[PDB]
Amino acid sequence: VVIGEKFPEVEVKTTHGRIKLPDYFTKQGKWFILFSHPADFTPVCTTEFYGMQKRVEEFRKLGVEPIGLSVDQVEDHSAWIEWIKDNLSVEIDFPVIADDRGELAEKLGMIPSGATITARAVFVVDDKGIIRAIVYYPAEVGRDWDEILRLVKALKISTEKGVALPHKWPNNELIGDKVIVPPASTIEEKKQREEAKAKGEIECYDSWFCYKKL
Amino acid sequence: VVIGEKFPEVEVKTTHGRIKLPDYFTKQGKWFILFSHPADFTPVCTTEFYGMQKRVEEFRKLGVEPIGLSVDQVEDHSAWIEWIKDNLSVEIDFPVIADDRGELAEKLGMIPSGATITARAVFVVDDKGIIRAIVYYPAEVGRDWDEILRLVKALKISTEKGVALPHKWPNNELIGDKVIVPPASTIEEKKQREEAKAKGEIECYDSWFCYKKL
């Protein structure tokens, strides 16, 4: 699987019943973020599930659905959610795939060399079912969902507006939360630029490098 | 490609001259971060190079060497670097690979469906030539070098201390900067585990989730 690729058509067994991916999110006009985890009742992975559920509505409000996955079965899932209910007083309400046999995992590269379980994979998939971003972390280092957030927010704005987000946006070192506008060219297009450069939105460090407040 | 795998033996054309990978760094005791980017003379990408160069020393103190990659030419790189020096006052002193034609790029899945240039790919590879992490972010959304920094830190502290790192470490909501221990397979195991609580270090939620200060 490769960025810009269609997420394959695939039925999954999950904690919320059975669904067709991407269909089930795409038919709804919703993005999803598919994330894998090596093993239920693993400590790092439990802190991830904690932190995902506390950001759940921040993804949903952007119109992005988190959906989880691992090679364990739904009854291990249901127990682990119960455990996280009894123990951390947090209620898992995102769906969790039980991927019998790392069938989907192998379809989506989630299995490290020589293993049969998955690492920490993340796929940001949009309402066209197109793979927009792909993260593979190893079992020993847990993720920082706030980056995924940052990522998904930047993905939404750039899709919605036709803009690119600079490095570390919204806290970029050169231009902060300002976003970057596409290249002038044509001729009329260049008129619109330098007109707008009279204070004026768009600043530029150069012709190929202009940005504005959103 | 896939985490845990060895990094291909390949010779690359760079701004520091032709080099062989992983070799040029393994034999130094060093890790490297390889990262592709789409296009010299591009705005997002200029923010990232700026941002990498401003943290080049955070990466170097940890024994991790950055190295860039694009489908552009050496002479192409050398003019952009100079544009960075004259316009943003920062001198790029990490090597940047000229991957004429995308040979390597395509080896490592850096190219999106139907594209001929790289997206924003990151690879971390260690003193033992192994890919420990991989990211593919999209053209239109810049990376964030403090996440890759957090992750390399975590990767190093994981290899050295045997531990695992929770969600957003060293800022974990639940348990702050502390790390997670395993089940290390023995019987010296269980005594030392509980007889280390024995308030405090180590502390647990359940038998399977214990953790400790470093």
UniProtKB/Swiss-Prot annotation, chains A, B:
GO cellular component, one term: cytosol
BP GO annotations: cell redox homeostasis; cellular response to oxygen levels; cellular response to stress; hydrogen peroxide catabolic process; response to oxidative stress
S-S pairs: 204-210
Alphabetized CDD domains for the sequence: PRX_1cys
Compartment(s) of residence: Cytoplasm
pH dependence remark: Optimum pH is 4.8.
Other comment: The active site is a conserved redox-active cysteine residue, the peroxidatic cysteine (C(P)), which makes the nucleophilic attack on the peroxide substrate. The peroxide oxidizes the C(P)-SH to cysteine sulfenic acid (C(P)-SOH), which then reacts with another cysteine residue, the resolving cysteine (C(R)), to form a disulfide bridge. The disulfide is subsequently reduced by an appropriate electron donor to complete the catalytic cycle.
The protein's name in its UniProt record: Peroxiredoxin
UniProt source species: Pyrococcus horikoshii (strain ATCC 700860 / DSM 12428 / JCM 9974 / NBRC 100139 / OT-3)
Species classification: Archaea, Methanobacteriati, Methanobacteriota, Thermococci, Thermococcales
